[PDB]
Amino acid sequence: STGGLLLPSDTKRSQIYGSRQIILEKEETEELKRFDDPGLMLMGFKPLVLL
Amino acid sequence: DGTDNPLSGGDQYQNITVHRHLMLPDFDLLEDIESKIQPGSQQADFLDALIVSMDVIQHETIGKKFEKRHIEIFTDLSSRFSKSQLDIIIHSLKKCDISLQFFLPFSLGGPF
């Protein structure tokens, strides 16, 4: 609202679902999609007739 | 605990409360189910709840047509049921052409 110049930390991320806004940090979104370190984890074996 | 049902005549239709009607779900209902761990230790019936649900479905399907009308059940089935009408509800559900799906707790028949 002043022109000027915004900077990475001067902004948030949001989604407006229905009639309500939800606000998160960049790192919050980047983190909520975290489950594991890279690499495969063996989950047992299955026949090549079921897939 | 009580009975705030839209229809409740006499002894039947008790310990049942139709919490919500048919409109757009928002964080209001999500909060409401997020904070309703209360027992309300008065177990009466389960079929009456489904009958009231389908009846209010027919009641509030005015000005808003629905292509698929759905009802889900979650009951321990440990309370005594009611046999007031069964064929009548079967006929009313066939004429309403709605396909219910029944869900049940862990009781089907180590660290589960």
CSV table of C-alpha atoms in Angstrom, one decimal:
chain,number,residue,atom,x,y,z
A,1,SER,CA,0.0,0.0,0.0
A,2,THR,CA,3.1,2.3,-0.1
A,3,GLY,CA,4.7,1.0,-3.3
A,4,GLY,CA,8.3,0.7,-2.2
A,5,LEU,CA,9.7,-2.8,-2.2
A,6,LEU,CA,8.7,-6.0,-0.4
A,7,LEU,CA,11.2,-8.6,0.8
A,8,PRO,CA,10.8,-12.4,1.2
A,9,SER,CA,9.9,-12.2,4.9
A,10,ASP,CA,7.4,-9.4,4.2
A,11,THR,CA,4.9,-11.8,2.8
A,12,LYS,CA,2.8,-14.8,4.0
A,13,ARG,CA,0.9,-17.5,2.1
A,14,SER,CA,-2.8,-18.0,2.4
A,15,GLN,CA,-5.9,-19.9,1.2
A,16,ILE,CA,-9.4,-18.5,1.4
A,17,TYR,CA,-11.7,-21.5,1.7
A,18,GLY,CA,-15.5,-20.8,1.9
A,19,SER,CA,-15.7,-17.6,4.0
A,20,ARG,CA,-12.5,-17.9,5.9
A,21,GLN,CA,-8.8,-17.2,5.2
A,22,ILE,CA,-6.0,-19.4,6.5
A,23,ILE,CA,-2.5,-18.0,6.8
A,24,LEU,CA,0.8,-19.8,6.9
A,25,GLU,CA,4.5,-19.1,6.6
A,26,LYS,CA,6.5,-20.3,3.6
A,27,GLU,CA,8.4,-22.8,5.7
A,28,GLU,CA,5.1,-24.0,7.2
A,29,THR,CA,3.8,-25.1,3.8
A,30,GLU,CA,7.2,-26.4,2.8
A,31,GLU,CA,7.3,-28.5,6.0
A,32,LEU,CA,3.7,-29.9,6.0
A,33,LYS,CA,4.6,-32.0,3.0
A,34,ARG,CA,7.4,-33.8,4.9
A,35,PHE,CA,7.2,-37.5,5.7
A,36,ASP,CA,10.6,-39.1,5.3
A,37,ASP,CA,14.2,-38.7,4.3
A,38,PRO,CA,14.9,-39.5,0.7
A,39,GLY,CA,15.4,-43.1,-0.4
A,40,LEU,CA,13.4,-46.3,-0.5
A,41,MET,CA,12.1,-48.2,2.5
A,42,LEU,CA,11.5,-51.9,1.8
A,43,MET,CA,8.0,-52.9,2.5
A,44,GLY,CA,8.2,-56.6,1.6
A,45,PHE,CA,7.8,-58.5,-1.6
A,46,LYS,CA,4.8,-59.3,-3.9
A,47,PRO,CA,4.2,-61.5,-6.9
A,48,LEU,CA,4.4,-60.1,-10.4
A,49,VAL,CA,0.8,-61.1,-10.9
A,50,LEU,CA,-0.9,-58.8,-8.4
A,51,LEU,CA,0.3,-55.5,-9.7
B,1,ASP,CA,-28.5,-36.5,26.8
B,2,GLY,CA,-31.8,-34.9,25.8
B,3,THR,CA,-33.9,-34.9,22.6
B,4,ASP,CA,-33.9,-31.9,20.4
B,5,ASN,CA,-35.4,-33.8,17.5
B,6,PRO,CA,-37.4,-32.1,14.7
B,7,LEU,CA,-40.0,-34.8,15.3
B,8,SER,CA,-40.3,-36.8,18.6
B,9,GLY,CA,-43.7,-38.2,19.7
B,10,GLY,CA,-44.0,-39.9,23.0
B,11,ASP,CA,-41.5,-42.5,24.2
B,12,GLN,CA,-40.1,-43.2,20.7
B,13,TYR,CA,-37.6,-40.8,19.0
B,14,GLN,CA,-35.6,-40.2,22.2
B,15,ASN,CA,-31.9,-39.6,22.9
B,16,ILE,CA,-31.7,-38.4,19.3
B,17,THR,CA,-30.7,-34.8,18.2
B,18,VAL,CA,-30.6,-33.9,14.5
B,19,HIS,CA,-27.7,-31.5,14.8
B,20,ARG,CA,-27.5,-30.1,11.3
B,21,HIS,CA,-29.6,-29.6,8.2
B,22,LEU,CA,-28.6,-29.8,4.5
B,23,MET,CA,-26.5,-26.8,3.5
B,24,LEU,CA,-22.8,-25.9,2.8
B,25,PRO,CA,-20.4,-27.5,5.4
B,26,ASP,CA,-17.8,-25.1,6.8
B,27,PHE,CA,-15.4,-25.0,9.7
B,28,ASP,CA,-18.4,-24.6,12.0
B,29,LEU,CA,-19.4,-28.2,11.7
B,30,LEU,CA,-15.7,-29.3,11.7
B,31,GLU,CA,-15.3,-27.5,15.0
B,32,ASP,CA,-18.5,-28.9,16.3
B,33,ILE,CA,-17.4,-32.5,15.7
B,34,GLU,CA,-13.9,-31.4,16.9
B,35,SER,CA,-15.3,-30.6,20.4
B,36,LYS,CA,-18.1,-33.2,21.0
B,37,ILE,CA,-16.3,-36.0,22.8
B,38,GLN,CA,-19.1,-35.9,25.4
B,39,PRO,CA,-20.7,-39.3,26.1
B,40,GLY,CA,-24.2,-38.2,27.0
B,41,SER,CA,-24.9,-41.5,28.8
B,42,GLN,CA,-28.4,-42.3,27.5
B,43,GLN,CA,-28.3,-45.0,24.8
B,44,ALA,CA,-31.8,-45.5,23.2
B,45,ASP,CA,-31.8,-46.5,19.5
B,46,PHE,CA,-30.0,-46.2,16.2
B,47,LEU,CA,-32.6,-47.0,13.5
B,48,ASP,CA,-34.9,-44.2,14.6
B,49,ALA,CA,-32.0,-41.8,13.8
B,50,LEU,CA,-31.7,-43.1,10.3
B,51,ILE,CA,-35.5,-42.9,9.8
B,52,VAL,CA,-35.5,-39.3,11.0
B,53,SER,CA,-32.5,-38.6,8.7
B,54,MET,CA,-34.2,-39.9,5.6
B,55,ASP,CA,-37.5,-38.2,6.5
B,56,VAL,CA,-35.8,-34.8,6.9
B,57,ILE,CA,-34.0,-35.5,3.7
B,58,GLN,CA,-37.4,-35.7,2.0
B,59,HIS,CA,-38.5,-32.7,4.0
B,60,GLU,CA,-35.6,-30.4,3.1
B,61,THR,CA,-35.2,-31.4,-0.6
B,62,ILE,CA,-37.2,-28.4,-1.6
B,63,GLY,CA,-35.7,-25.8,-3.8
B,64,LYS,CA,-32.5,-27.9,-4.1
B,65,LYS,CA,-32.6,-31.1,-6.0
B,66,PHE,CA,-30.1,-33.8,-5.0
B,67,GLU,CA,-28.7,-36.4,-7.5
B,68,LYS,CA,-27.3,-38.8,-4.8
B,69,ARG,CA,-28.6,-38.8,-1.3
B,70,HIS,CA,-26.4,-40.7,1.2
B,71,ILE,CA,-26.5,-41.7,4.8
B,72,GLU,CA,-23.8,-43.4,6.9
B,73,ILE,CA,-24.2,-45.3,10.2
B,74,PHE,CA,-21.8,-45.5,13.1
B,75,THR,CA,-23.3,-47.6,16.0
B,76,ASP,CA,-21.9,-50.1,18.4
B,77,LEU,CA,-25.4,-51.8,18.1
B,78,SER,CA,-25.2,-52.8,21.8
B,79,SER,CA,-28.5,-51.2,22.6
B,80,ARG,CA,-31.9,-52.8,22.0
B,81,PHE,CA,-33.4,-52.0,18.6
B,82,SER,CA,-37.0,-51.2,17.7
B,83,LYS,CA,-39.4,-53.2,15.4
B,84,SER,CA,-42.1,-50.5,15.2
B,85,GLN,CA,-41.8,-50.5,11.4
B,86,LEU,CA,-39.3,-52.3,9.1
B,87,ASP,CA,-41.1,-53.0,5.8
B,88,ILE,CA,-42.5,-49.4,5.8
B,89,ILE,CA,-39.0,-48.0,5.9
B,90,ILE,CA,-37.8,-50.5,3.3
B,91,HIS,CA,-40.5,-49.3,0.9
B,92,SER,CA,-39.9,-45.7,1.7
B,93,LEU,CA,-36.2,-46.1,1.0
B,94,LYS,CA,-36.8,-47.9,-2.3
B,95,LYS,CA,-39.2,-45.2,-3.4
B,96,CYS,CA,-36.5,-42.7,-2.4
B,97,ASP,CA,-33.9,-44.7,-4.3
B,98,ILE,CA,-31.1,-43.9,-1.8
B,99,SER,CA,-28.3,-46.4,-1.2
B,100,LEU,CA,-27.1,-46.3,2.4
B,101,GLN,CA,-23.7,-47.6,3.5
B,102,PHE,CA,-23.3,-49.1,6.9
B,103,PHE,CA,-20.1,-48.7,8.9
B,104,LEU,CA,-19.4,-50.4,12.2
B,105,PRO,CA,-16.8,-50.3,15.0
B,106,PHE,CA,-13.8,-52.7,15.4
B,107,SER,CA,-16.4,-55.4,16.1
B,108,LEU,CA,-16.4,-57.4,12.9
B,109,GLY,CA,-16.6,-60.9,14.5
B,110,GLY,CA,-2.0,-58.2,18.0
B,111,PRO,CA,-1.4,-54.5,18.4
B,112,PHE,CA,-4.6,-53.4,16.6
